[PDB]
Amino acid sequence: VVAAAEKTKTKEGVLYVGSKTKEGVVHGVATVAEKTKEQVTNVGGAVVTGVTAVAQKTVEGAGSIAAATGFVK
Amino acid sequence: VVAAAEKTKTKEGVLYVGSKTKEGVVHGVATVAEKTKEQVTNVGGAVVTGVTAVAQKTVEGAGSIAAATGFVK
Amino acid sequence: VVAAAEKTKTKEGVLYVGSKTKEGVVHGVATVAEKTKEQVTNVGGAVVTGVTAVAQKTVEGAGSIAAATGFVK
Amino acid sequence: VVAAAEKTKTKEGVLYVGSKTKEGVVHGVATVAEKTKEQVTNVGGAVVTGVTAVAQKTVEGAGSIAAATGFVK
Amino acid sequence: VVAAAEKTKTKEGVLYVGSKTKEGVVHGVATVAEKTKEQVTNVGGAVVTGVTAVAQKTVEGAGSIAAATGFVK
């Protein structure tokens, strides 16, 4: 499991957000197990969670994610 | 499982968001197991979750995701 | 499972969103198992979820996703 | 399972969205198993889900998805 | 399973959407199994789901999806 990232090197990249929520419940990244034997979970990269979620320009630079998730029996 | 990303190198990339929610419930990334033996889960890359979700310009730079998810028995 | 991305190098890329929701429930990426033996799940790339979802210009740069999901018995 | 993407290098790319929803339920990407033995699932690329979903210019840059999903017994 | 994409290099690409929904339920990409032995599922490329779904200019750059889905017994 190898990840390699290389980077070699007027409004730009500007965000305005206004949010008005009376009630918010946000769970993000959740793993829940009840009465479970084996649970393997991988979350990788960018997760944005919100009642109001904005992601801008998340990977201008190179980004690498490598995942190997699981079990050997 | 190998990921490689390489990058070699007027309004641009500008977002305006207004959001008004009375009630919000957001779950993001969730794995739930009840009474389960084997659960393997991989989430990779960008997940944006929201009552109002905006993703802009998520990978201008090179992005690589490699996943190998599972089990050998 | 190999992913490689290479990048070599007036309003542009501008988004306006207004959203008004009284009630929102959003689930994002979810894996649920009840009483299951084997569940293998891979989510890759960009997922945008929302009562109002906008994705703009998600991969101007090169993007690669490679997935190998499953089991050997 | 190999994916390779290469990129070599007045309103352009502009989106306006207004959304007004009283009630929204959105499920994004979901895998549900009840009482199942083997479930293999891969989701790749960009999924936009919403009461109002907009995708603009999703892959101007080259994008590659490769998936190998399944089981060997 | 190999995918390769290469890219070598007045209103253009502009979308206006207004949506007004009282009630919305959207399921995105879903795999559901009840009482099933083997279910293999691959979703690739861009899926836009919505009460109001717009996709504009989804692959100006080259895009490749390769999928090999299934089982060997």
Spatial separation of the C-alpha atoms in residues C21 and E40, rounded to whole Å: 36
Q: Radius of gyration (Cα) for chain B, nearest Å?
A: 18
Give the nearest chain C residue to B59 (CA atoms).
C59
In a mutational test of the C interface, the residue from D27, D37, D73 whose CB has the highest number of chain C CBs within 10 Å is D27
Mind giving me the DSSP string for C11-71?
EES-EEEEEEEEEEEE--EEEEEES-SEEEEEE-S-EEEEEEEEEESTTSS-EEEEEEEEE
Give the nearest chain D residue to C59 (CA atoms).
D59
Which residues are within 8 A (CB) of E13 and not within 5 positions of it... i.e. 6 or more apart?
Answer: D12, D13, D14, D56, D57, E56, E57
Which runs of E-coded beta strand occur in chain A?
2-8, 11-12, 15-26, 29-34, 38-43, 47-56, 63-72
Q: Which residues of D16-47 are buried (b: 16+ CB within 10 A; e: fewer)?
A: bbbbbbebbbbbbbbbbbbebbbbbbbbbbbb
Q: Which subunits have 3 or more CB–CB pairs within 8 Å of chain D?
A: B, C, E
| Residue C43 Cα distances to A4, B42, C10, E22, angstroms | 21, 6, 37, 31
Which pair of structure tokens corresponds to residue D49?
């889900």
Which residues are within 8 A (CB) of A50 and not within 5 positions of it... i.e. 6 or more apart?
Answer: A26, B26, B49, B50, B51, B53
D27 carries a ligand binding annotation: yes
Phi, psi of E42 (to 5 degrees): -125, 130
Q: After which residues is chain A broken (C to N over 2.5 A)?
A: 9
Contact call for A8 and B7, based on CB within 8 A: yes
Which residues are within 8 A (CB) of C2 and not within 5 positions of it... i.e. 6 or more apart?
Answer: B1, B2, B3, B4, B66, C66, D1, D2, D3
Chain A residues with beta carbon closer than 8 angstroms to that of C28 = 49
Sign of CA dihedral C15, E23, C30, B21: positive
Which pair of structure tokens corresponds to residue D62?
């080259």
Contact call for E24 and C59, based on CB within 8 A: no
Taking phi first (over 0 means left), then psi (-120 to 50 degrees means alpha), and beta for anything else, what does residue D58 get?
A: alpha
Chain B residues with beta carbon closer than 8 angstroms to that of C30 = 27, 29-32
Which pair of structure tokens corresponds to residue E21?
């929904």
E10: helix, strand or coil: coil
| Residue B14 Cα distances to A12, A54, A65, B18, D19, angstroms | 7, 12, 27, 14, 19
Chain B residues with beta carbon closer than 8 angstroms to that of C58 = 55, 57-59
* Contact residues, C window 18-37, toward D, CB-based 8 Å cutoff: 18-37
Q: CA E33: distance to chain centroid?
A: 21
Sign of CA dihedral D46, D47, D50, D55: positive
CB atoms closer than 10 angstroms to residue A7: 16
